[PDB]
Amino acid sequence: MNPFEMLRIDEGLRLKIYKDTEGYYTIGIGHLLTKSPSLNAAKSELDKAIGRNCNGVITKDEAEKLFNQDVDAAVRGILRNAKLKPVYDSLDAVRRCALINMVFQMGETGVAGFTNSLRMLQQKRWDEAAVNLAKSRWYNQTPNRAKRVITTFRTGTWDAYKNL
């Protein structure tokens, strides 16, 4: 595994402009393009973003790159986050990876709301923490994806996604 494949599985990949749950134009792995109703504008923002005559559709790699700039942006925020910063620093590279997964999935705000759970991770209390996170509304909401993320944390390996 690697982080793109992680999200590939979790968020899914989209190579053609789409609308999300909130109506927003998006593309690749959750890459929101714009908030205005206009396809016209997304199209344009994309072309731009990607750098050529895409026309509402990109490549796989073209997407990875977008995906790369977004992980980058997420990390950056994490480090500017005071609740998130310390946790993130405590984490070995791969679990850092799970934390981006979550953030990606629920925003920085939502993530930092798992008080006890973060403390647990920070402390490097890998099992209890596993246990704990299985209690949340997160786990009921999106079970599969929650389970995978949790194993990542438990173990600090790509066990849950590698055969996938």
From Swiss-Prot:
Any Gene Ontology biological process: defense response to bacterium
Pfam families, sorted: Phage_lysozyme
Matches recorded under InterPro entries: Endolysin_T4_type, Glyco_hydro_24, Lysozyme-like_dom_sf, Lysozyme_dom_sf, Phage_lysozyme-like, T4-type_lysozyme
Record keywords, A-Z: Antimicrobial, Bacteriolytic enzyme, Cytolysis, Glycosidase, Host cell lysis by virus, Host cytoplasm, Hydrolase, Viral release from host cell
GO MF term list: lysozyme activity
Mutation effect (residue 26 to E): Complete loss of activity at neutral pH; covalently bound substrate
One Gene Ontology cellular component: host cell cytoplasm
Record's catalysed reaction(s): Hydrolysis of (1->4)-beta-linkages between N-acetylmuramic acid and N-acetyl-D-glucosamine residues in a peptidoglycan and between N-acetyl-D-glucosamine residues in chitodextrins
Listed PANTHER family: T4-TYPE LYSOZYME 1-RELATED
Designated name of the protein: Endolysin
Lineage: Viruses, Duplodnaviria, Heunggongvirae, Uroviricota, Caudoviricetes
Gene (name only): E
